[PDB]
Amino acid sequence: MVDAFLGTWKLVDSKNFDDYMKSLGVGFATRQVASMTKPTTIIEKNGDILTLKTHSTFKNTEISFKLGVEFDETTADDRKVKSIVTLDGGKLVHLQKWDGQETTLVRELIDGKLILTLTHGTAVCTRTYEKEA
Numbered sequence: 612m613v614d615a616f617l618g619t620w621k622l623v624d625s626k627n628f629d630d631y632m633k634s635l636g637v638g639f640a641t642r643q644v645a646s647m648t649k650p651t652t653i654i655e656k657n658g659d660i661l662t663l664k665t666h667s668t669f670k671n672t673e674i675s676f677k678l679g680v681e682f683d684e685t686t687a688d689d690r691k692v693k694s695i696v697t698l699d700g701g702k703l704v705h706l707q708k709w710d711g712q713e714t715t716l717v718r719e720l721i722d723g724k725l726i727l728t729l730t731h732g733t734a735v736c737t738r739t740y741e742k743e744a
């Protein structure tokens with residue numbers, strides 16, 4: 612079940628985000644500001660429809676999806692992708708596909724913290740979120 616993921620979460624640690632963003636071709640100036648941004652992520656559910664909000668002073672996104680059903684997405688860096696999110700080994704696994712490329716955004720609860728692992732190419736970023744509410 613998804614239920615321990617639900618709520619409001621704040622970024623408290625980030626490792627290799629610049630490498631991940633550079634791998635996606637994000638420009639230097641956007642990486643600069645993103646490296647100093649601390650987002651809030653809000654995860655809500657209504658039945659098997661999940662809504663994932665990511666808020667900040669820089670960029671803001673919102674997606675809604677049905678678990679295990681593909682959806683179109685336009686990412687914070689303006690990639691137009693085909694996406695699917697599923698529970699897999701108790702993790703929320705978000706797979707984005709575009710132009711034959713793939714990136715995964717994997718969320719796992721470890722000791723009450725939500726660990727977001729971002730993989731594109733060889734770049735692996737780990738971001739740790741702490742529960743606000």
Ligand SMILES: CCCCCCCCCCCCCCCCCC(=O)O
Nearest residue numbers: 645648650665667670671672687688
């Ligand atoms: C909405 C805020 C996202 C994080 C700061 C802006 C970064 C914009 C350029 C890179 C976007 C890459 C895809 C989205 C990464 C999501 C990271 C996260 O939720 O912590």
